[PDB]
Design a binder for this molecule. Sequence first.
Ligand SMILES: COc1ncccc1CC(=O)N1CCC[C@H](C(N)=O)C1
Ligand SMILES: [Zn+2]
Length: 139
Amino acid sequence: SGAIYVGNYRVVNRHLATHNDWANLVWEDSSRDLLVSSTTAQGCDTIARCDCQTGVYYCSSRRKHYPVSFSKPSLIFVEASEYYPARYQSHLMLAVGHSEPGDCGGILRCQHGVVGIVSTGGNGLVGFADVRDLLWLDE
Ligand SMILES: COc1ncccc1CC(=O)N1CCC[C@H](C(N)=O)C1
Ligand SMILES: [Zn+2]
């Protein structure tokens, strides 16, 4: 699991969004596996505004942070699961790395800050949902 807390927002994987996330919906994108809900107290996570393709991500199946190089945000065909049917998820960055379903939520970080959260995985690869384009998060 896991989330990013920036300002008066909470950023989770859409498929893991709780009842309170839906009761306080701000923005959501099924094809991005993203959901933004509102928070009462002030979040202080810094979002990265960069062009990076190297980062370090947290992996709870190992309790380890991994240094990885990843692709630029794009459309990747994500196989069917119980949360979604066979579809193309947009804004997804792929890296060669380990992951398990319970790892969705771990953050990929660079020197600039928070790049995105773990979203997909399979075949010795791990995918991250990018959040760097969401400029409205800091205002
Ligand atoms: C090895 O499998 C995994 N590895 C990491 C995270 C997640 C998985 C499982 C996986 O691919 N998905 C299940 C949950 C929703 C995902 C999505 N965004 O479409 C797809
Ligand atoms: Zn960066």
